[PDB]
Coordinates of C-alpha atoms in Angstrom, one line a residue:
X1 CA -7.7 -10.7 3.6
X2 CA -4.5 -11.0 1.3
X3 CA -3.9 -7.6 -0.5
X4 CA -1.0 -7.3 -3.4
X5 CA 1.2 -4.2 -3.4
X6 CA 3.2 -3.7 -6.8
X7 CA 6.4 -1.3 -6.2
X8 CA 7.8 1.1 -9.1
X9 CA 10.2 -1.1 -9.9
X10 CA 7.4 -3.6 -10.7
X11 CA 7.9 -6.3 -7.9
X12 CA 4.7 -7.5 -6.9
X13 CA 4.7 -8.8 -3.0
X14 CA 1.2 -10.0 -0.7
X15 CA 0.7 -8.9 2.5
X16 CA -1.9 -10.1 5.2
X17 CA -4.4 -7.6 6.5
X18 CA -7.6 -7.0 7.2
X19 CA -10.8 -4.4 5.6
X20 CA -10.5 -2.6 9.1
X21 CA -6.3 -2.0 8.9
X22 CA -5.2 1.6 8.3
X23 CA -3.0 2.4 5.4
X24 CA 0.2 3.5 7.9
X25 CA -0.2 -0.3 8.5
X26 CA -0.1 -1.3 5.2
X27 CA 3.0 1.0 4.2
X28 CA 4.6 -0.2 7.5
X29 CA 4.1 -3.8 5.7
X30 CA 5.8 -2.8 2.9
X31 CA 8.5 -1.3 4.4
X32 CA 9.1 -4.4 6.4
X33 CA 9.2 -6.2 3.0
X34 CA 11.2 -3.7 0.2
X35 CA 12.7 -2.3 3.2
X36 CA 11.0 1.6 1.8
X37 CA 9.9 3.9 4.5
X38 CA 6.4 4.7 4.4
X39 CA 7.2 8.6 4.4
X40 CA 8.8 7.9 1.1
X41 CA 5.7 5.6 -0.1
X42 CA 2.9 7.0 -2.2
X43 CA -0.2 4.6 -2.5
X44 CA -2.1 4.8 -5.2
X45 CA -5.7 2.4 -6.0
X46 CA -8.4 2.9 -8.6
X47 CA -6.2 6.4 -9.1
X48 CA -7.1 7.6 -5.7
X49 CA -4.6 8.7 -3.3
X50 CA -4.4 6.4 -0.5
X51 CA -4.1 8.2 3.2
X52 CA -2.2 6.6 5.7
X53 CA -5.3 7.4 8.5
X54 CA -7.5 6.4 6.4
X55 CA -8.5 2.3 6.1
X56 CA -8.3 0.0 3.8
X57 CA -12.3 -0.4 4.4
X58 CA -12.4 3.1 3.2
X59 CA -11.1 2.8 0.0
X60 CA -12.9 -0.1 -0.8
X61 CA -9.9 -2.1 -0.7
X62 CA -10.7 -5.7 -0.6
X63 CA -8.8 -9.6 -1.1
X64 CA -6.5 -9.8 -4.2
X65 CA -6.8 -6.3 -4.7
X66 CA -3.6 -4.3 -6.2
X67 CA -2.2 -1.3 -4.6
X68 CA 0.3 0.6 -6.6
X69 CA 3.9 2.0 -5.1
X70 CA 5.3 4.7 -6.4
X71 CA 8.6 6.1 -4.8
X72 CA 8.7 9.9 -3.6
X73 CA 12.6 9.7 -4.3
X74 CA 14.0 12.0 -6.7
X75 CA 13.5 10.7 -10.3
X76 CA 10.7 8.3 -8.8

């Protein structure tokens, strides 16, 4: 299952995982991609939070679904 992340600089990257993949995978992903640690990730889908112990299963979260990245930094 291919899932797309858009950052908040509005770069759009895929990443392989499955339904059953926690979201501390998925921001570990990302941070092997933008290079962003996850602590400094907020995930957002369908305007819900998404929680890194929680799945992607969970969230309903499914193939060439976007995930939105918003940065925790200061001015972010």
């Amino acid at each position: 299952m291919q899932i797309f992340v858009r950052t908040l600089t509005g770069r759009t990257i895929t990443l392989e995982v499955e339904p059953s993949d926690t979201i501390e995978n998925v921001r570990a992903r990302i941070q092997d991609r933008e290079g962003i640690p996850p602590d400094q990730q907020r995930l957002i889908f369908a305007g819900r939070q998404l929680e890194d112990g929680r799945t992607l299963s969970d969230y309903n979260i499914q193939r060439e679904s976007t995930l939105h990245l918003v940065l925790r930094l200061r001015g972010g």
